[PDB]
Paper text:
The [name] homotrimer on the surface of [name]-[name]-2 is critical for viral entry by binding cellular receptor angiotensin-converting enzyme 2 (ACE2) and mediating fusion of viral and cell membranes. [name]-[name]-2 neutralizing antibodies bind the [name] to block its interaction with the ACE2 receptor or interfere with the pre-fusion to post-fusion conformational transition of the [name] required for membrane fusion. In this study, we characterized the previously reported F61, which was isolated from convalescent patients infected with prototype [name]-[name]-2, as a broadly neutralizing antibody against all VOCs including Omicron BA.1, BA.1.1, BA.2, BA.3 and BA.4 sublineages by utilizing antigen binding and cell infection assays. We also identified and characterized another broadly neutralizing antibody D2 with epitope distinct from that of F61.
The complexes of the WT-S bound by F61 or D2 Fab were prepared and single particle cryo-EM data were collected, resulting in the binary WT-S-F61 and WT-S-D2 structures determined at 3.62 and 3.25 Å, respectively. In the binary S-F61 and S-D2 complexes, the S trimer is in the open form with all three RBDs adopting similar upright position with a tilt angle of ~90 degree. In the S-D2 complex, each up-RBD was bound by a D2 Fab covering the solvent-exposed outer surface, resulting in an epitope on the RBD spatially distinct from ACE2-binding site. Upon binding, the VH domain of D2 contacts the up-RBD by aligning in parallel with the outer surface, whereas the VL domain does not have contact with the RBD. The interaction between D2 VH domain and up-RBD buried a total of 953 Å2 surface area from the VH domain and 944 Å2 from the RBD. Consistently, the D2 epitope residues are more conserved than the F61 epitope residues and there are only three sites (346, 446 and 452 sites) exhibiting amino acid variation among all 22 sites recognized by D2. The results showed that F61 but not D2 was able to compete with ACE2 receptor in binding WT-RBD, indicating their distinct binding epitopes on the RBD. In other words, F61 and D2 epitopes are only fully exposed in the up-RBD, indicating that the down to up conformational change is a prerequisite for the binding of F61 and D2. The major neutralizing mechanism of D2 would not be ACE2 competition because its epitope does not overlap with ACE2-binding site. The destabilization of S trimer by representative class 3 antibody S309 was suggested to be its mechanism of action, and D2 may utilize similar working mechanism.
Residue numbers in the entry:
A (entry chain B): 26 to 66, 81 to 141, 154 to 176, 187 to 246, 263 to 331, 334 to 337
B (entry chain L): 1 to 110
C (entry chain H): 1 to 123
D (entry chain B): 963 to 1010
E (entry chain C): 338 to 526, 530 to 577
Write the structure that this text describes.
């Protein structure tokens, strides 16, 4: 449904470490370069180990997300809501409605039991808003960046690194995903993270200014093996090529006991 | 056991100020502020005054009154038709260790 | 908005027992203390029982002491009053009361009142 | 330098953590594995 | 924890409730150095160990138990009150705190505030709140009236007069339950800084030996420590 191309977007800061003028190669769940991102403009999407959620301008409509294995009172579900003033995160057992949105609010669920977490902070969200949600070993993480953009027909061709915001120790399973809107009496792209190897470039101030994905094409893999961004003329041995077994046959020779 | 004392019934014409008096022992009214409840007949009681003069959201500014000593006074101004109700003053007693509820005053308009 | 559902109130014989259940919605049940108030028709309001955040019994009306038991479950968001040795004096309308102060020691007022259920005690 | 952060078979690549959370009878084998790995790496460096 | 300890009223043993403690630091050491509690027993837990090592999902249980029958409410111990009111798992990793409540929980008139279940059909499972309002029936003797065949009523008011003996006098006892769970959050409980000297340092998870000097490198507000080529830490915030 109206797929688009993510031109080198969705690169976040893998760790809280200062590196200056160091080309470091990290192995982590990143969004592959030049991939297909669905252009929605509210289905229940799968999580699949991560999501690169964005927003064209959103004109203050995109106002939260819902995370839950079952979206019912049977199991706990995570809930991030923006009330236009503060971010509100709850992990209570909610019975989420089929069409939750946002004056008409509080209709998103009916039952709120077995509350385990509560958190209020400054609000997360013309204007390009980007987000990465990931759940590694029960520590739910949220990265973001809010850069002003024009020509907002589709994702721009530029590089911008996502500084971490919050590291929630929720510890629950996350398998389904759906955003929230503010119905009144404008689009959000979605990408998916996969295990990839990058070659991050840090400047003198510790900000990532460029990166190359070490699976996109042979030139990028060559840059990653050399650990550089410029490669001189020559022939470089990059990887290995091995054919894989297919069928695993077993053969034995053709006097049963009475 | 101390009992909060209220006049049985009060009748006033619309636009006439209404004074309701709650009488209590020093241990009950003196320690904690009285709370006034306006109950329309056949309906569940609704809090009218919290902590004496202070009014909870949804209570008209014309409702007023001041508690002096062991006596709590409720003052109603700009009285209108349909404001008729039974008023109860409630103050917990430290000495009795039980909540005390007033007999009630029957406000009405003819 | 806080809604206080009322149930378990019905005509009962004098030498019998009856349990009253209050349903709490629109607010955290554990955070706010819950109280029982009864009012017989044509009579002034009478406080019956009180409980707090820790579910410790604040007390009982002297007339109902030793015949009435109060208990609440924070997880179920519900409070139950057990009445024994019911009498004609006991017959009244029991309204759930929501108390802003958990200790209820001072400056404690009832933010919301339940619609109430009618206990009738007769032979 | 960069081959000082390799397990070589031990539970951890740092001596302090192994010494802290293991019984001295039991950390002996892990320390010995690290000794062997680091000695082999330094021998290869010196030889080349 | 102090607010729970300084509660105006304590829950009855039949109405005992579990209070969840999480998302806040807990100073276990303050309880010991206070020494304001008549009794304090740590089963499977050492006071120094509790400070250094912590378990998530701390649970606080509040109930009033006579000093004489306080012993019955122990892990691996069976008592009339323990069997039908509060049950503790034998493999309990928790500390129980008991102090006299005669000053406020004892009344000359007497208190119907505290009640106990004398009779129950079966012994309660560990950490099971008792909820059996109905009188003994068993279909052998069933009716609102009391046959007297071991029927009566399970709940009886406790008597706590000042004249009563110290064992009879009410004691406030809280049970703390410590368990290890999958959820990452844990409730766990700091010298000065010496610059231009060889010292051992223990920054927040980063340990090593070296000389600390004020730096010109400015980190991004989310970056804790710095590194360099070959990945040897050479900066810290
Ligand atoms: C995106 O999808 C189109 C068809 O839906 C496909 O032709 C294209 O190769 C896809 N892009 C990538 C990077 O796989
Ligand atoms: C509440 O959640 C905890 C942990 O998820 C679980 O052990 C407990 O049984 C739940 N209780 C209810 C009433 O849902
Ligand atoms: C996630 O789902 C798996 C699959 O059954 C289950 O084993 C695990 O306990 C779940 N984790 C949580 C935190 O619910
Ligand atoms: C790095 O920091 C300097 C500090 O003056 C500032 O100009 C800017 O943020 C960055 N400059 C360059 C050249 O990277």
């Amino acid at each position: 449904p109206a797929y688009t191309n993510s031109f080198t977007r969705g690169v976040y800061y893998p760790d809280k470490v200062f590196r200056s003028s160091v080309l470091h190669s990290t192995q982590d769940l990143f969004l592959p370069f030049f991939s297909n991102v669905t252009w929605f403009h509210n289905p229940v999407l799968p999580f699949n180990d991560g999501v690169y959620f964005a927003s064209t301008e959103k004109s203050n409509i995109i106002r939260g997300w819902i995370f839950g294995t079952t979206l019912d009172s049977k199991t706990q579900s995570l809930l991030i809501v923006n009330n236009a003033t503060n971010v509100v995160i709850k992990v209570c057992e909610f019975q989420f409605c089929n069409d939750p949105f946002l004056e008409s609010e509080f209709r998103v669920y009916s039952s709120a039991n077995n509350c385990t977490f509560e958190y209020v902070s400054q609000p997360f969200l013309k204007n390009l808003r980007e987000f990465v949600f990931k759940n590694i070993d029960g520590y739910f993480k949220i990265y973001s960046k809010h850069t002003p953009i024009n020509l907002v027909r589709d994702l721009p061709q530029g590089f911008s690194a996502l500084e971490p915001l919050v590291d929630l120790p929720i510890g629950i399973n996350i398998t389904r995903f759906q955003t929230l809107l503010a119905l009144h009496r404008a689009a959000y792209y979605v990408g998916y993270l996969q295990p990839r190897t990058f070659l991050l470039k840090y400047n003198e101030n510790g900000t990532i200014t460029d990166a190359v994905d070490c699976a996109l094409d042979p030139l990028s893999e060559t840059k990653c093996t050399l650990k550089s961004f410029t490669v001189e003329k020559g022939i470089y041995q990059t990887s290995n090529f091995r054919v894989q077994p297919t069928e695993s046959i077993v053969r034995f020779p053709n006097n049963l006991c009475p | 056991q101390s009992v909060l004392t209220q006049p049985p019934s009060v009748s006033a014409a619309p636009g006439q100020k209404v004074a309701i008096s709650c009488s209590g022992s020093t241990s009950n009214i003196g320690d904690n502020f009285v709370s006034w409840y306006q109950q329309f007949p056949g309906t569940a009681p609704k809090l009218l005054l919290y902590d004496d003069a202070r009014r909870p959201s949804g209570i008209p500014d014309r409702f007023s009154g001041s508690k002096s000593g062991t006596s709590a006074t409720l003052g109603i101004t700009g009285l209108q038709t349909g404001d008729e109700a039974v008023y109860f003053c409630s103050t917990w007693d430290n000495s009795l260790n039980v909540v005390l509820f007033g007999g009630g005053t029957k406000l009405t308009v003819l | 908005e806080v809604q206080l559902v009322e149930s378990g109130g019905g005509l009962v014989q004098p030498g019998r027992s009856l349990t009253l259940s209050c349903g709490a919605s629109g607010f955290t049940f554990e955070d706010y203390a819950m109280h029982w108030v009864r009012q017989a028709p044509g009579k002034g309001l009478e406080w019956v029982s009180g409980i707090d955040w820790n579910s410790g019994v604040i007390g009982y009306a002297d007339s109902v002491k030793g015949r009435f038991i109060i208990s609440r479950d924070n997880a179920k968001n519900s409070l139950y009053l057990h009445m024994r040795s019911l009498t004609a004096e006991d017959t009244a309308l029991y309204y759930c009361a929501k108390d802003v102060y958990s200790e209820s020691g001072s400056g404690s007022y009832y933010d919301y009142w339940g619609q109430g259920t009618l206990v009738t005690v007769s032979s | 330098v960069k081959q000082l952060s390799s397990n070589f078979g031990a539970i951890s690549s740092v001596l302090n953590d192994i010494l802290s959370r293991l019984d001295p009878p039991e950390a002996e084998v892990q320390i010995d594995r690290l000794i062997t790995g680091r000695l082999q790496s330094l021998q290869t460096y010196v030889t080349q | 924890f102090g607010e729970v300890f300084n509660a105006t009223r304590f829950a009855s043993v039949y109405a005992w409730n579990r209070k969840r403690i999480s998302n806040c630091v807990a100073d276990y050491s303050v309880l010991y150095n206070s020494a304001s509690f008549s009794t304090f027993k740590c089963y499977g837990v050492s006071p120094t160990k509790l400070n250094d090592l912590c378990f998530t999902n701390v649970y606080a249980d509040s109930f009033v138990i006579r000093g004489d029958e306080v012993r019955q409410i122990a892990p691996g111990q069976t008592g009339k009150i323990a069997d039908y009111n509060y049950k503790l798992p034998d493999d309990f990793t928790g500390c129980v705190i008991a102090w006299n409540s005669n000053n406020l929980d004892s009344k000359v008139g007497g208190n119907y505030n505290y009640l106990y279940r004398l009779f129950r059909k079966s012994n309660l499972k560990p950490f099971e709140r008792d909820i059996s309002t109905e009188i003994y029936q068993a279909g052998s003797t069933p009716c609102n009236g009391v046959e007297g065949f071991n029927c009566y009523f399970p709940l009886q008011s406790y008597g706590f007069q000042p004249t009563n003996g110290v064992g009879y006098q009410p004691y406030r006892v809280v049970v703390l339950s410590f368990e290890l769970l999958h959820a990452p959050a844990t409730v766990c409980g700091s010298t000065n800084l010496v610059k231009n000297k060889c010292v051992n340092f223990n920054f927040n998870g980063l340990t090593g030996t070296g000389v600390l000097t004020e730096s010109n490198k400015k980190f991004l507000p989310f970056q804790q420590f710095g590194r360099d080529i070959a990945d040897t830490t050479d900066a810290v915030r």
